[PDB]
N, CA, C and O atoms as CSV, one atom per row, in Angstrom:
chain,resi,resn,atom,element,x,y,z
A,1,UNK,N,N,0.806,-1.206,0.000
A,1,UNK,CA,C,0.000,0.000,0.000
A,1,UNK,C,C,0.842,1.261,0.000
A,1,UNK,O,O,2.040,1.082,-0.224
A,2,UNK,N,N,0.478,2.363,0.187
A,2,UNK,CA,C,0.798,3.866,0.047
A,2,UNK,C,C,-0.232,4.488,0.267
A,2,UNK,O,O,-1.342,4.333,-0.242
A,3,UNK,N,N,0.319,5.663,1.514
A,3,UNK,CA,C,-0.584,6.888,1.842
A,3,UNK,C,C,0.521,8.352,1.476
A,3,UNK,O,O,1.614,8.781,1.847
A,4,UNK,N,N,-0.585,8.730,0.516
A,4,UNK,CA,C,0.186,10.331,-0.266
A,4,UNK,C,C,-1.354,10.902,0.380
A,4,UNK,O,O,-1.525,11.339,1.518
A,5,UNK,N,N,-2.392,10.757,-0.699
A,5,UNK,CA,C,-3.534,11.537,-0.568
A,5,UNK,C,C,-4.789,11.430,0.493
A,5,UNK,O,O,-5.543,12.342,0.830
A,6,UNK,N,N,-4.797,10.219,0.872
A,6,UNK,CA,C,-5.698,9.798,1.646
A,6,UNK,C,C,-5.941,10.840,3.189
A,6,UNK,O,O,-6.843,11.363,3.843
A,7,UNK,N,N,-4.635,10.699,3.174
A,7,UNK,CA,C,-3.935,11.446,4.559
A,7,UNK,C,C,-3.085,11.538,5.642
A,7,UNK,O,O,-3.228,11.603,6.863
A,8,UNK,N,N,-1.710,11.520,4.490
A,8,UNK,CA,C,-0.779,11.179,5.809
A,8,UNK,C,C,-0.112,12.321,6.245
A,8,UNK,O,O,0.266,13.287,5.582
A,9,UNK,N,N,0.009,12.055,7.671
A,9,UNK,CA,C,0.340,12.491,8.953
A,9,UNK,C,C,1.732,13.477,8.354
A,9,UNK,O,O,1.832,14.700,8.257
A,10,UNK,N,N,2.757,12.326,8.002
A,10,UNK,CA,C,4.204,12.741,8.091
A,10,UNK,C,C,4.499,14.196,7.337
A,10,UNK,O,O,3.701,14.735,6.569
A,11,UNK,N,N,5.526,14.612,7.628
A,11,UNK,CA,C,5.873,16.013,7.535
A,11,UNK,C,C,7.250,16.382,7.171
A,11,UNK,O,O,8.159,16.438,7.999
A,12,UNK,N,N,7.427,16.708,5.550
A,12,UNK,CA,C,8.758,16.555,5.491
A,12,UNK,C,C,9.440,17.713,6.095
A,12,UNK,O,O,8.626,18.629,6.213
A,13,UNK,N,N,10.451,17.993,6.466
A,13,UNK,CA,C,11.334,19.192,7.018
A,13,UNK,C,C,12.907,19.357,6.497
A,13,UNK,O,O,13.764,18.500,6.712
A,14,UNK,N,N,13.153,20.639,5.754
A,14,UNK,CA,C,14.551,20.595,5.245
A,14,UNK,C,C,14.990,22.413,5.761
A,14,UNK,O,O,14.547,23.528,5.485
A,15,UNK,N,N,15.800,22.004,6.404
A,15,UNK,CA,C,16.575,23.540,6.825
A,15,UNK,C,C,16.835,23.090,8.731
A,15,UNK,O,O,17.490,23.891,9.398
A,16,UNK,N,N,16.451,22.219,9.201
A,16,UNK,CA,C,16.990,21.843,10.498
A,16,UNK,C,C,18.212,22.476,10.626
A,16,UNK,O,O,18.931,22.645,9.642
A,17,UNK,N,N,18.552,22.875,11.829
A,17,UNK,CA,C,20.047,23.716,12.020
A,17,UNK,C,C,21.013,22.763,11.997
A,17,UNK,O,O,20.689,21.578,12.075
A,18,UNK,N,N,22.127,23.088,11.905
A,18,UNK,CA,C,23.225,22.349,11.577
A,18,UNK,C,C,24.097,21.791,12.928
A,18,UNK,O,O,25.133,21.130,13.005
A,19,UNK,N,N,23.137,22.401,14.017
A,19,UNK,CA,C,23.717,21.751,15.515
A,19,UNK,C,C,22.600,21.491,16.555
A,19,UNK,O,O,22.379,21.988,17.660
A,20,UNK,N,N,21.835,20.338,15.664
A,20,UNK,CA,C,20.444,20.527,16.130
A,20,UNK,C,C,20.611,18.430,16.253
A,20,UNK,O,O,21.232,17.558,15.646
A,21,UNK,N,N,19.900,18.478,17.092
A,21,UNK,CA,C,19.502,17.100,17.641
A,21,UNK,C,C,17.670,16.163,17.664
A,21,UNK,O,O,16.532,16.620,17.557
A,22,UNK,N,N,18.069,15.087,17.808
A,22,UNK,CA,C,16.420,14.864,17.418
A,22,UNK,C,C,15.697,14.925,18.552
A,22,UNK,O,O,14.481,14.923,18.361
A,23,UNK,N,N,16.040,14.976,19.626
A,23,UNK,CA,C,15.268,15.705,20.434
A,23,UNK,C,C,14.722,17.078,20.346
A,23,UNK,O,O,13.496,17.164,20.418
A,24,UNK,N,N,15.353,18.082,20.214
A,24,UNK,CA,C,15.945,19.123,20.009
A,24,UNK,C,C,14.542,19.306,18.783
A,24,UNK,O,O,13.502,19.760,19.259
A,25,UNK,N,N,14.544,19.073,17.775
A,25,UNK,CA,C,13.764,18.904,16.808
A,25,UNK,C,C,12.065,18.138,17.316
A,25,UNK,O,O,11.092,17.851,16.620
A,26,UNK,N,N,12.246,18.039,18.440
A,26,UNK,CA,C,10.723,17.263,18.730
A,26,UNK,C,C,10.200,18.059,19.381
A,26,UNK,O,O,9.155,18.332,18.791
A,27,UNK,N,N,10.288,18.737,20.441
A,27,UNK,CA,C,10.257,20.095,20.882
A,27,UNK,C,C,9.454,21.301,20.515
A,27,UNK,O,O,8.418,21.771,20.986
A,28,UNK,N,N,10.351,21.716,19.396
A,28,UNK,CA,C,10.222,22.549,18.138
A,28,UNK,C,C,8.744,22.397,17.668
A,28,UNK,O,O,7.963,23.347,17.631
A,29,UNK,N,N,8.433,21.141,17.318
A,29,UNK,CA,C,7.202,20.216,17.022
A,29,UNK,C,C,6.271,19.920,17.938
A,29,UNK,O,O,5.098,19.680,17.652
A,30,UNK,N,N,6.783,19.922,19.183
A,30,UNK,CA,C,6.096,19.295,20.297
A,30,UNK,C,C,4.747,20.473,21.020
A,30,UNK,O,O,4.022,20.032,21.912
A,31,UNK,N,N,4.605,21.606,20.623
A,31,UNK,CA,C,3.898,22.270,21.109
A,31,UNK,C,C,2.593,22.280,20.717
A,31,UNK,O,O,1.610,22.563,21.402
A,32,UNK,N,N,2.667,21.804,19.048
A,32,UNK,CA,C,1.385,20.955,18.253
A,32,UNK,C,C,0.518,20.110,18.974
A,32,UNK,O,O,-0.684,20.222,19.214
A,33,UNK,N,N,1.767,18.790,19.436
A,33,UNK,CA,C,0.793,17.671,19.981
A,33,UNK,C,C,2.160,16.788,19.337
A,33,UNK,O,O,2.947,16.905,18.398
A,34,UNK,N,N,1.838,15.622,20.737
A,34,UNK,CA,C,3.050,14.098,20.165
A,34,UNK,C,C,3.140,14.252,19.163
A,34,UNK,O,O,2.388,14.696,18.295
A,35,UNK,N,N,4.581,13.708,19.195
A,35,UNK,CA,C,4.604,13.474,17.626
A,35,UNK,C,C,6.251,13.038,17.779
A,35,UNK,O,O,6.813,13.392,18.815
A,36,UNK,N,N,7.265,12.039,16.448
A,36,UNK,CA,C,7.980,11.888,16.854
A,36,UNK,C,C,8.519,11.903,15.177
A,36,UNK,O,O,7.930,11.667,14.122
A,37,UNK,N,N,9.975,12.313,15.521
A,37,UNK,CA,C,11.258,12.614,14.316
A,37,UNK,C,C,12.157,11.111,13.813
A,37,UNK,O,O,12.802,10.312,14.491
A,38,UNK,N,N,11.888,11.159,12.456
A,38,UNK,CA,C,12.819,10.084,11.724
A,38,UNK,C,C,13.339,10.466,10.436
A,38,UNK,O,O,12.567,10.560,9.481
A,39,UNK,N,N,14.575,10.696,10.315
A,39,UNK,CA,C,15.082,11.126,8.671
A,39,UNK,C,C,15.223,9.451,8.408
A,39,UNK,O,O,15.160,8.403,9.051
A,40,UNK,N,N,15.511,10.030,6.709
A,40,UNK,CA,C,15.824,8.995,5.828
A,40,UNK,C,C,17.084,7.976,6.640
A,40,UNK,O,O,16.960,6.753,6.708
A,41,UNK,N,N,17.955,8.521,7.062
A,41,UNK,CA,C,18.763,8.089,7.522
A,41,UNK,C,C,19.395,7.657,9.205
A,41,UNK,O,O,20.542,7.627,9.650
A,42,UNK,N,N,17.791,7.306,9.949
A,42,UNK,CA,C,17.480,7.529,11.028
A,42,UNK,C,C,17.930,5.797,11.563
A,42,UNK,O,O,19.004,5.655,12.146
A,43,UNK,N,N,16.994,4.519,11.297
A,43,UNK,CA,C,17.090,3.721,11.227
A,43,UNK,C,C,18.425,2.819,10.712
A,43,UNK,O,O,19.308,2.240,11.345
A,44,UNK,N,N,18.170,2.963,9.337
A,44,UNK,CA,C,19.930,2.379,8.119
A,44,UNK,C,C,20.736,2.767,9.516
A,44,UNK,O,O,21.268,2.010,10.327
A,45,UNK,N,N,20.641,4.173,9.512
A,45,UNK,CA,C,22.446,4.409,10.029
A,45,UNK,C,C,22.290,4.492,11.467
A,45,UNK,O,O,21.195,4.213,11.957
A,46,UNK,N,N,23.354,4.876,12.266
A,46,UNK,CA,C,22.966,5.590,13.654
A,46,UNK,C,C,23.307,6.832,14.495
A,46,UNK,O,O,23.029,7.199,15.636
A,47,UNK,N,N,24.146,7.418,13.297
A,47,UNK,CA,C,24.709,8.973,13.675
A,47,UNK,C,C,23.348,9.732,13.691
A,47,UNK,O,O,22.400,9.399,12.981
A,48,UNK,N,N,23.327,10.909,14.666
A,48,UNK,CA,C,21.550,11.321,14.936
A,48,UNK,C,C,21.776,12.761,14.732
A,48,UNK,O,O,21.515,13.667,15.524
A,49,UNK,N,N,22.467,12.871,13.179
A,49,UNK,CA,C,22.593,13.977,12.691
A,49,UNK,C,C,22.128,13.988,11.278
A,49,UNK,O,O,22.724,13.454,10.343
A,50,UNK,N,N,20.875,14.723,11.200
A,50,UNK,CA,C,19.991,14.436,10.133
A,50,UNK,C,C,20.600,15.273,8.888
A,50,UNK,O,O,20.581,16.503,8.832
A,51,UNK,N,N,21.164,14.388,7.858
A,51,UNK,CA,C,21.991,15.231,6.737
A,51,UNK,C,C,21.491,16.158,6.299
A,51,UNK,O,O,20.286,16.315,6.494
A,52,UNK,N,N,22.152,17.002,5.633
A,52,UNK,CA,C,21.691,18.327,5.061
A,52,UNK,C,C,20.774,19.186,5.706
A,52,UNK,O,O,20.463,20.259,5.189
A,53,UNK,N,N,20.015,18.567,7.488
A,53,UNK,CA,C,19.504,19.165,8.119
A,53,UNK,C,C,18.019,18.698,7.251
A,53,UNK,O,O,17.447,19.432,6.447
A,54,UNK,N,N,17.655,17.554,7.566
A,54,UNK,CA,C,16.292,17.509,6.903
A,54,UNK,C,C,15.767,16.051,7.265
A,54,UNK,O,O,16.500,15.085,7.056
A,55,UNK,N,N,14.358,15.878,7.868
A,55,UNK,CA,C,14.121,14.650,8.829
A,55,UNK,C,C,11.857,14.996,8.260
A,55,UNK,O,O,11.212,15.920,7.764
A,56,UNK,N,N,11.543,13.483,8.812
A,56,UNK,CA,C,10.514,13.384,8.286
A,56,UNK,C,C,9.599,13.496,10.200
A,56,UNK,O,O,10.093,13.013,11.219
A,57,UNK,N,N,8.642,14.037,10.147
A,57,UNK,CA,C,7.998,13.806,11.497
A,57,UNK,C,C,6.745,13.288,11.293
A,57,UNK,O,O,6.223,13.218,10.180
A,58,UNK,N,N,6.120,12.838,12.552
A,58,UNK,CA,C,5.173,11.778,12.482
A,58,UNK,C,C,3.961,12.123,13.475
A,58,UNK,O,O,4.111,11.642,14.598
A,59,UNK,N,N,3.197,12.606,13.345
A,59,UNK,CA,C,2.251,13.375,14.452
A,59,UNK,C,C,1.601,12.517,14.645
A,59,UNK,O,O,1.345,11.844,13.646
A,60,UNK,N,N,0.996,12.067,15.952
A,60,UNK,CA,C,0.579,11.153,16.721
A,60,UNK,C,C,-0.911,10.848,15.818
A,60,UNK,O,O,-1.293,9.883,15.156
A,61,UNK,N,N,-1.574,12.301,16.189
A,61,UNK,CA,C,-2.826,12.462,15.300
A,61,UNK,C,C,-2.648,13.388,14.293
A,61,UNK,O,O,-1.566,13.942,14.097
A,62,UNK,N,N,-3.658,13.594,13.630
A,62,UNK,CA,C,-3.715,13.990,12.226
A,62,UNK,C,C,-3.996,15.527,12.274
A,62,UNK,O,O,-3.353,16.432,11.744
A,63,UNK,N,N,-5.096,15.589,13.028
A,63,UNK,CA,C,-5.550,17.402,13.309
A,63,UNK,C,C,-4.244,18.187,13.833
A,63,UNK,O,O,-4.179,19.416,13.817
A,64,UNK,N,N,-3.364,17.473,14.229
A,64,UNK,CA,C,-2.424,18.841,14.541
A,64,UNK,C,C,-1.176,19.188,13.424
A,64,UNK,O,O,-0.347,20.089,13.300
A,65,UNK,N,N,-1.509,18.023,12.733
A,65,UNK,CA,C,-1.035,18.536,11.173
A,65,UNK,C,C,-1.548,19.797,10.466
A,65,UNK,O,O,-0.744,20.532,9.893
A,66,UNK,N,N,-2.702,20.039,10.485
A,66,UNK,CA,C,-3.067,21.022,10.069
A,66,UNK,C,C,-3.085,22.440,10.364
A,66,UNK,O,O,-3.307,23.386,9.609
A,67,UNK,N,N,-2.794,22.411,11.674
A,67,UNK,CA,C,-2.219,23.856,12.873
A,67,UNK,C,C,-1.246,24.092,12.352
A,67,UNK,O,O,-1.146,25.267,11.996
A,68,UNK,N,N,0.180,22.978,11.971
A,68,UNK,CA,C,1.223,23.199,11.503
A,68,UNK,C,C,1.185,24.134,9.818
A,68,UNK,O,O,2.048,24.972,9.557
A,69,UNK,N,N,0.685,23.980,9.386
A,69,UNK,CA,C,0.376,24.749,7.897
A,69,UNK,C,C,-0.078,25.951,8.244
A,69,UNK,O,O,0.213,26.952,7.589
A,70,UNK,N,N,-0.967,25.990,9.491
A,70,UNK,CA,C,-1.236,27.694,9.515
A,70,UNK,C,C,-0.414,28.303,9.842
A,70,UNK,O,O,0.007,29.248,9.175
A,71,UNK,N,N,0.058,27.952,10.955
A,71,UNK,CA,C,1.465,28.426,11.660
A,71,UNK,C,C,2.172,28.594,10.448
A,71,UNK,O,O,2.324,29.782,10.161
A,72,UNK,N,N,2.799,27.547,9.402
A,72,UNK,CA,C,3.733,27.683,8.383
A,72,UNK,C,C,3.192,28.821,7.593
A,72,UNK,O,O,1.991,29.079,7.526
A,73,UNK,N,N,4.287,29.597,6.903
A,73,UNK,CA,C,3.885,31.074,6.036
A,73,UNK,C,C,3.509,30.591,5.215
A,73,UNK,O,O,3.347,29.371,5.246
A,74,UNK,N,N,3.161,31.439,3.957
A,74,UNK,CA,C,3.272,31.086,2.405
A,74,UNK,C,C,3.984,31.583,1.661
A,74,UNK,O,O,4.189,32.797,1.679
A,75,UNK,N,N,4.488,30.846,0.896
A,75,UNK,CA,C,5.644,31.737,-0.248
A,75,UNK,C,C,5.682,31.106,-1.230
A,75,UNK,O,O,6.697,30.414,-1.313
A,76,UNK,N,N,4.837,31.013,-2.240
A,76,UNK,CA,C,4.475,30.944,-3.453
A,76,UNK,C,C,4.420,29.562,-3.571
A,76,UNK,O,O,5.204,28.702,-3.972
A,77,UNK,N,N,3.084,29.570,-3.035
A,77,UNK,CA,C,2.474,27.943,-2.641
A,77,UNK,C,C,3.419,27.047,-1.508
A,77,UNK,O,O,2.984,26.034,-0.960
A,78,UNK,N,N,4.594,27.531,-1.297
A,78,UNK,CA,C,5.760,26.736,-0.334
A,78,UNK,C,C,5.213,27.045,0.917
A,78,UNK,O,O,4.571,28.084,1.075
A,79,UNK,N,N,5.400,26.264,1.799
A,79,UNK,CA,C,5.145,26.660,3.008
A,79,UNK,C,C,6.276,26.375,3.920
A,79,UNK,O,O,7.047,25.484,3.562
A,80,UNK,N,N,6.496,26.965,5.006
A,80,UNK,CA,C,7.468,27.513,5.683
A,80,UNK,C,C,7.525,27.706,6.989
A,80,UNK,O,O,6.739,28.570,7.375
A,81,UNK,N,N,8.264,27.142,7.925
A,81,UNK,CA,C,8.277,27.276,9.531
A,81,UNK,C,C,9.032,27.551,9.761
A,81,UNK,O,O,10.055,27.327,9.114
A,82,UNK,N,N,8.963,28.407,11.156
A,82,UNK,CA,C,10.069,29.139,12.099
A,82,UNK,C,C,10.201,27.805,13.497
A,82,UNK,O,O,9.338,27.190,14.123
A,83,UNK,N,N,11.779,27.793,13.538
A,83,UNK,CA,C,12.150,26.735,14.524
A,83,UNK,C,C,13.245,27.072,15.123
A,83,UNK,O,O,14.361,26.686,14.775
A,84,UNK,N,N,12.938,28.028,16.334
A,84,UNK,CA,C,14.271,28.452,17.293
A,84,UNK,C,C,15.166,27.003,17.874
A,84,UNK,O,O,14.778,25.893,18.238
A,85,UNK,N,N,16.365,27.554,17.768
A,85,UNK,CA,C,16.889,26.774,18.972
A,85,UNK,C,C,18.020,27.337,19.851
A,85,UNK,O,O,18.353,28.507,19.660
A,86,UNK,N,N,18.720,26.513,20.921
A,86,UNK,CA,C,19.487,26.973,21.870
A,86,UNK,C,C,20.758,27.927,21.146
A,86,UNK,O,O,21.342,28.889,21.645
A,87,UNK,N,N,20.944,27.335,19.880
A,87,UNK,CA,C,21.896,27.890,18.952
A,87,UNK,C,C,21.468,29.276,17.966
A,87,UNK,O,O,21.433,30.496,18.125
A,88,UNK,N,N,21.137,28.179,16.727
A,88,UNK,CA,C,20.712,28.949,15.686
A,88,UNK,C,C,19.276,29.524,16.100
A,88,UNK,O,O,18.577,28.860,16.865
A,89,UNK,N,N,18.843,30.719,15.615
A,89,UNK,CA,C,17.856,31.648,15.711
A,89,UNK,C,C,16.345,31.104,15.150
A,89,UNK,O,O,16.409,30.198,14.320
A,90,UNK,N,N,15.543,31.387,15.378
A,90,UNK,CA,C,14.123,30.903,14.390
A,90,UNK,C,C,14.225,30.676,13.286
A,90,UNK,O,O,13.743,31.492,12.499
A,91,UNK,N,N,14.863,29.531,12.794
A,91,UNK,CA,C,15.259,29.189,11.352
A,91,UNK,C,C,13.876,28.827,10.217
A,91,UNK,O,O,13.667,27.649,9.925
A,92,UNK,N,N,13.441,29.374,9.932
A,92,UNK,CA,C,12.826,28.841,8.737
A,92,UNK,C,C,12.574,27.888,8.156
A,92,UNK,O,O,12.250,28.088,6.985
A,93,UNK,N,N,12.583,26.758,8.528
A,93,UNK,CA,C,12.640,25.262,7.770
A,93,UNK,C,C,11.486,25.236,7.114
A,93,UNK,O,O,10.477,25.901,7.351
A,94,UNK,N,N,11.767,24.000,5.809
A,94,UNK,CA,C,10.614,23.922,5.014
A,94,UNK,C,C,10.194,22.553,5.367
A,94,UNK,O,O,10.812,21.488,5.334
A,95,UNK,N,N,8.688,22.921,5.799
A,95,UNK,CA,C,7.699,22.101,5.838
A,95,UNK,C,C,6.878,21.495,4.647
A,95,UNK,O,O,6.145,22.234,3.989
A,96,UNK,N,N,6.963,20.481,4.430
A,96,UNK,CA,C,6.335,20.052,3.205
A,96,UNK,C,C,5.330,18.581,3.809
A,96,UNK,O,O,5.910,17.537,4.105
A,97,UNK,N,N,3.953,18.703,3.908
A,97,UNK,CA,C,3.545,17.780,4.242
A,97,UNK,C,C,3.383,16.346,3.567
A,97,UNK,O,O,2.446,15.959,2.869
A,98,UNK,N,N,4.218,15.845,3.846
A,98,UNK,CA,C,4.865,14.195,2.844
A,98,UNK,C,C,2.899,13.999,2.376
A,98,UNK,O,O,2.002,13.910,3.213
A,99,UNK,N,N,2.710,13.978,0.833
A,99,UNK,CA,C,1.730,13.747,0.131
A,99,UNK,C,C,2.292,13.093,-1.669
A,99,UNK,O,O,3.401,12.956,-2.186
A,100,UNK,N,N,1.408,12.932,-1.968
A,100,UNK,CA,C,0.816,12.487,-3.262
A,100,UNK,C,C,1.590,13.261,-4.662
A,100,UNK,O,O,0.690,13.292,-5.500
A,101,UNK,N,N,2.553,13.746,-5.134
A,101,UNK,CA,C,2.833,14.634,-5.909
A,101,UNK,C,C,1.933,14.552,-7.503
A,101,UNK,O,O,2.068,13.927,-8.555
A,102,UNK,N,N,0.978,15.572,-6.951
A,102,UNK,CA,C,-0.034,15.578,-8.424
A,102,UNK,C,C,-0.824,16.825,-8.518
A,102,UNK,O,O,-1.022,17.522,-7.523
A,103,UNK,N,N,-1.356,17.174,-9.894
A,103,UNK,CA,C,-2.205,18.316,-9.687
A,103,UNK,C,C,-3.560,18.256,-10.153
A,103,UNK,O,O,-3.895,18.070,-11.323
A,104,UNK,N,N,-4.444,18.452,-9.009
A,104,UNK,CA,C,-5.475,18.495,-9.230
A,104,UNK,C,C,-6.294,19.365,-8.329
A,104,UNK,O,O,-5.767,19.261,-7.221
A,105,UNK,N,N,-7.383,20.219,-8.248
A,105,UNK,CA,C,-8.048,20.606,-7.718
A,105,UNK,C,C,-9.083,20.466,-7.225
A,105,UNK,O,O,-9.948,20.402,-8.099
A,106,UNK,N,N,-9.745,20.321,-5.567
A,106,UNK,CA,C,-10.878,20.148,-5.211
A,106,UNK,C,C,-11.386,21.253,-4.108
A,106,UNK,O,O,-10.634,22.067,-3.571
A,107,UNK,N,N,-12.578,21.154,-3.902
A,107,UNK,CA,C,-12.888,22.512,-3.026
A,107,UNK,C,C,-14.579,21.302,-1.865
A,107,UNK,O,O,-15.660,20.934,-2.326
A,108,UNK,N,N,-14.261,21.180,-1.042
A,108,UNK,CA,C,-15.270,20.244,0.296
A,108,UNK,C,C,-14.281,20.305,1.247
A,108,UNK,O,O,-13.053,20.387,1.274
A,109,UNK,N,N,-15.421,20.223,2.205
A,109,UNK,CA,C,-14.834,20.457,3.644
A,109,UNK,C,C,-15.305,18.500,4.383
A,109,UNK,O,O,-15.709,17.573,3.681
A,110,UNK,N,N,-15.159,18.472,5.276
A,110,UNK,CA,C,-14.573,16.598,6.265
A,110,UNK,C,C,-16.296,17.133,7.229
A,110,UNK,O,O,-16.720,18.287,7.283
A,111,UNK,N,N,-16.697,16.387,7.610
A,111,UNK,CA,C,-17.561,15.975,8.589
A,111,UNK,C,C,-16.906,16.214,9.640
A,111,UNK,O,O,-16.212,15.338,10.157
A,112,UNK,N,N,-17.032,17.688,10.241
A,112,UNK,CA,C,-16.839,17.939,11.645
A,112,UNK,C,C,-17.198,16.610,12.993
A,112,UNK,O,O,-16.384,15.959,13.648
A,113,UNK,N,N,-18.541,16.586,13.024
A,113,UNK,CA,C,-18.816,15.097,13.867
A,113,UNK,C,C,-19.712,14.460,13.109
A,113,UNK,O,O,-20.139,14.751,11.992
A,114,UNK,N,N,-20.002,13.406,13.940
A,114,UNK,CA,C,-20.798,12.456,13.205
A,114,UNK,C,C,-21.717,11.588,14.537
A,114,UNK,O,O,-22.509,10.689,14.255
């Protein structure tokens, strides 16, 4: 199987600081709601220094995915987060919510309750 569109959770992130830890990075995230950090190279390897500064996160639930996008700016359809740390300053990282790469357009809203 594969979840792009349906609705997944995960959250790509590229611009992590360059003296930043995965704790450190959960934090950052953690004010959303649980949620927990894995780069590509999290598992394979075991150095817990996410290359090029870029790691995938995993939100416990789904609704606080979507706080994260408001919070994130816009810049020409990109979206964009501020992520202080003990070091580097409110860095900017790009948030890209791990999906489906396709174009299409729809306009409905989800069943609040039921």
């Amino acid at each position: 199987g594969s979840s792009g569109s349906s609705g997944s959770r995960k959250v790509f992130v590229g611009g992590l600081p360059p003296d930043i830890d995965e704790d450190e990075i959960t934090a950052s995230f953690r004010r959303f709601g649980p949620l927990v950090v894995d780069w590509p190279h999290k598992a394979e390897s075991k150095s817990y220094f996410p290359p090029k500064g870029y790691a995938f996160l995993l939100f416990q639930e789904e609704s606080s995915v979507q706080a994260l996008i408001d919070a994130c700016l816009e810049e020409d359809g990109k979206l964009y987060l501020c992520v202080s740390s003990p070091t580097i300053k409110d860095k900017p990282v790009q948030i890209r919510p791990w999906n489906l790469s396709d174009s299409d357009f729809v306009m409905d809203s989800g069943p609040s309750s039921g």
